Amino acid sequence: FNMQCQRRFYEALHDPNLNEEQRNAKIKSIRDDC
């Protein structure tokens, strides 16, 4: 967990292109990795 993870979360949240499921999976991936 650092600046990259923060920015990745912020981006993933604010990503209209993705739906709920995709977005939550993205958040989960960041959180798992970091």
CA 11 – CA 16 distance, rounded (Å): 10
Is the CB of residue 30 less than 8 Å from the CB of residue 5? Answer: yes
Q: Which domain holds residue 14?
A: 3-33
Is the CB of residue 7 less than 8 Å from the CB of residue 29? Answer: no
Structure determination technique employed: NMR
In 3D, which of 5, 3, 4 has the Cα closest to residue 32?
A: 5
Number of domains composing the chain = 1
Indicate the residue type of 21.
E
